[PDB]
């Protein structure tokens, strides 16, 4: 497993094995690709980030991933695949977040994008994310570059 510190200096433990940290993760993160572009969402408080959020009680992590993509980008998922899992060792709470990769079929218009501004398309990620004020802190640590490198090696992208 990979171990590093996030943007707010909290310890993060990253793994690509099947749910090693928790049997039932309460958070999900979805890396979205629409054609040859990256599908992101603009959080009203955080900024540009890949879709994700909290898992509902009656809902499972896979169903929560599809729901969060639809809510934050208005996108229809063609295929959803589990990539890995990460644990965030916070100051007051420890969270377990599942990473999913989603190939996007289409973007449908919605009346409301909930707690986000809606879908944002990127041909390629800017340089460098860590010091970009328009981006969310969740995109600023090592979770994103390591996950993207694992997507290339698996043959899921390009
Ligand atoms: Mg969310
Ligand atoms: Mg949401």
Swiss-Prot record:
<feature type="binding site">
    <location>
        <position position="68"/>
    </location>
    <ligand>
        <name>Mg(2+)</name>
    </ligand>
</feature>
<dbReference type="GO" id="GO:0035539">
    <property type="term" value="F:8-oxo-7,8-dihydrodeoxyguanosine triphosphate pyrophosphatase activity"/>
</dbReference>
<protein>
    <recommendedName>
        <fullName>Putative 8-oxo-dGTP diphosphatase YtkD</fullName>
        <ecNumber>3.6.1.55</ecNumber>
    </recommendedName>
</protein>
<dbReference type="InterPro" id="IPR020476">
    <property type="entry name" value="Nudix_hydrolase"/>
</dbReference>
<dbReference type="InterPro" id="IPR015797">
    <property type="entry name" value="NUDIX_hydrolase-like_dom_sf"/>
</dbReference>
<dbReference type="InterPro" id="IPR014078">
    <property type="entry name" value="Nudix_YtkD"/>
</dbReference>
<dbReference type="Pfam" id="PF00293">
    <property type="entry name" value="NUDIX"/>
</dbReference>
<dbReference type="GO" id="GO:0005737">
    <property type="term" value="C:cytoplasm"/>
</dbReference>
<dbReference type="GO" id="GO:0016818">
    <property type="term" value="F:hydrolase activity, acting on acid anhydrides, in phosphorus-containing anhydrides"/>
</dbReference>
<keyword id="KW-0460">Magnesium</keyword>
<comment type="similarity">
    <text>Belongs to the Nudix hydrolase family.</text>
</comment>
<dbReference type="InterPro" id="IPR000086">
    <property type="entry name" value="NUDIX_hydrolase_dom"/>
</dbReference>
<feature type="domain" description="Nudix hydrolase">
    <location>
        <begin position="6"/>
        <end position="145"/>
    </location>
</feature>
<dbReference type="GO" id="GO:0046872">
    <property type="term" value="F:metal ion binding"/>
</dbReference>
<dbReference type="InterPro" id="IPR020084">
    <property type="entry name" value="NUDIX_hydrolase_CS"/>
</dbReference>
<keyword id="KW-0479">Metal-binding</keyword>
<comment type="function">
    <text>Involved in the GO system responsible for removing an oxidatively damaged form of guanine (7,8-dihydro-8-oxoguanine, 8-oxo-dGTP) from DNA and the nucleotide pool. 8-oxo-dGTP is inserted opposite dA and dC residues of template DNA with almost equal efficiency thus leading to A.T to G.C transversions. Functions, in conjunction with MutT, to protect vegetatively growing cells from DNA-damaging agents such as H(2)O(2) or t-BHP (t-butylhydroperoxide). The 2 proteins do not however protect spores.</text>
</comment>
<feature type="short sequence motif" description="Nudix box">
    <location>
        <begin position="53"/>
        <end position="74"/>
    </location>
</feature>
<feature type="binding site">
    <location>
        <position position="72"/>
    </location>
    <ligand>
        <name>Mg(2+)</name>
    </ligand>
</feature>
<keyword id="KW-0378">Hydrolase</keyword>
């Amino acid at each position: 497993m990979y171990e590093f510190k996030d943007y707010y200096q909290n310890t993060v433990q990253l793994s690509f094995d099947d749910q090693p940290f928790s049997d039932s993760p309460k958070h999900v993160w979805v890396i979205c690709r629409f054609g040859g572009k990256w599908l992101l969402t603009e959080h009203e408080d955080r900024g540009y980030e890949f879709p994700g959020g909290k898992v509902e009680p009656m809902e499972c992590a896979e169903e929560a991933a599809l729901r969060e993509v639809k809510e934050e980008t208005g996108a229809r998922v063609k295929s959803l695949k589990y990539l890995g899992q990460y644990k965030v060792l916070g100051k007051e709470k420890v969270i377990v977040k599942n990473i999913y990769f989603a190939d996007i079929e289409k973007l449908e218009k919605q009346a409301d994008y909930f707690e986000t501004k809606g879908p944002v398309l990127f041909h390629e990620l800017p340089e460098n994310l860590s010091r970009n004020k328009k981006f969310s802190f969740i995109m600023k640590d090592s979770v994103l570059p390591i996950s993207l490198k694992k997507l290339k090696e698996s043959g899921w992208i390009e």
